């Protein structure tokens, strides 16, 4: 008995990898007799031919670690492999910062706390990298 | 002068088209267009050709898959020959 | 029928990446000898196979308890894990 | 790179083809000229007195 023809068919009818298709060891004779895609679907319904289950990788251990790293752990010198600007792209980070500081100043203006001249001044000093952060900015603002 | 139809192309797969889709398969001369096959077929078997699909075969001839109108029956037209 | 402990120490004389295969052969040769039967007549239930390949092809266990029965018209032995 | 075996691999180009005129597989499809009968070059058929011995 040579069921390799069937395998190929079974693989397509079940819409699975030939390697996952399963033929019951007690019906090689019947299955050996399947010749059409139909005879196959039939043998499928009787459960003689079935598709094994595909596995998936378990991200459990990966989730735990993901928590520890979001909480700040497992990121010491001995756990870094990439250069510093590799782990954090300095240009991207300056865009993050400056947009914060520019957004902040923008609010205080519309809010009224700042006069278009005070704003202007601050803005110009932000673009000049005078504030390490919005907090640093607010502080400077209060004289 | 060459004739368009050569003879009916009877094979397992030619049977299924016939029984299941009302189609007649022929071995035609390769210079024949879908048009010439259509007319030649109607005039020979007195039927209405709805569609003609062709293929230049690895046999050196041209195969033609002719579908007849629901009004005619492939199984019957082919049965008389 | 009886239960026997098979020593697989001679499987080390065979390149390590091929221990499982040699083990298997050793079992059969042990049963065929201790149950006075031809190795042809010895049948190993898959259980024994899986026990031997449990940890890969090169990490076979130094022993294996196997339960075997002997009988029939040409003489033979059927075996399995325990 | 070896001029031998390794340079033989890149040979998947088509040049000489069945000739419309003579039937020999010598119709260079890139030059559109037959190296055997001269189709595509000469109306007359390619032929030379050196294709045979001087006195024959």
């Amino acid at each position: 008995t040579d069921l390799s023809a069937q395998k190929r068919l079974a693989a397509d009818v079940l819409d699975v990898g030939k390697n996952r298709v399963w033929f019951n060891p007690e019906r090689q004779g019947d299955i050996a007799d399947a010749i059409t895609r139909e005879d196959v679907r039939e043998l499928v319904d009787e459960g003689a031919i079935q598709a094994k289950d595909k596995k998936g990788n378990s991200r459990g251990r990966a989730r735990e670690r993901q928590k520890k790293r979001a909480k700040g752990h497992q990121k010491g010198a001995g756990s870094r492999k990439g250069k510093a600007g590799a782990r954090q792209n300095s240009k991207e980070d300056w865009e993050s910062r400056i947009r914060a500081q520019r957004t902040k100043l923008r609010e205080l203006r519309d809010e009224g706390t700042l006069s278009s001249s005070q704003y202007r001044d601050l803005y110009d000093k932000a673009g000049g990298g005078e504030f390490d952060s919005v907090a640093d900015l607010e502080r400077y603002i209060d004289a | 002068s060459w004739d368009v139809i050569k003879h009916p192309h009877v094979t397992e797969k030619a049977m299924n088209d016939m029984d299941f889709q009302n189609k007649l398969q022929f071995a035609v001369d390769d210079r024949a267009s879908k048009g010439e096959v259509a007319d030649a077929v109607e005039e020979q078997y007195d039927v209405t050709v709805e569609q003609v699909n062709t293929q230049n075969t690895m046999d050196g001839e041209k195969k033609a898959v002719v579908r007849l109108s629901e009004d005619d029956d492939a199984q019957e037209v082919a049965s008389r020959i | 029928e009886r239960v026997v402990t098979i020593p697989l120490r001679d499987a080390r004389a065979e390149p390590n990446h091929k221990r499982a295969d040699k083990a298997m052969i050793l079992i059969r040769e042990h049963l065929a000898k201790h149950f006075s039967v031809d190795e042809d007549a010895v049948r190993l239930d898959p259980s024994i196979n899986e026990a031997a390949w449990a940890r890969g092809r090169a990490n076979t266990p130094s022993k294996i308890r196997v339960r075997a029965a002997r009988f029939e018209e040409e003489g033979e032995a059927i075996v399995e894990a325990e | 790179t070896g001029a031998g075996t390794p340079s033989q691999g890149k040979k998947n180009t088509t040049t000489h083809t069945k000739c419309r005129r003579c039937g020999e597989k010598s119709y260079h499809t890139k030059k559109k000229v037959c190296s055997s009968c001269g189709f595509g070059k000469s109306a007359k058929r390619r032929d030379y007195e050196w294709q045979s011995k001087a006195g024959e």
Binding site: - | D30, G60 | - | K25
Partner: protein
Amino acid sequence: GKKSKATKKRLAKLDNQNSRVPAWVMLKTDERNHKRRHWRRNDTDE
């Protein structure tokens, strides 16, 4: 590759010329296809 209608035709002929001498010709001639061509071992023209 992309073949033409002419090309396809000849390949077709070649496949036909690649059959064996019918058993009845053996009998009729009281006793070999010298042009047998294998796709791998040989090479057609064009």
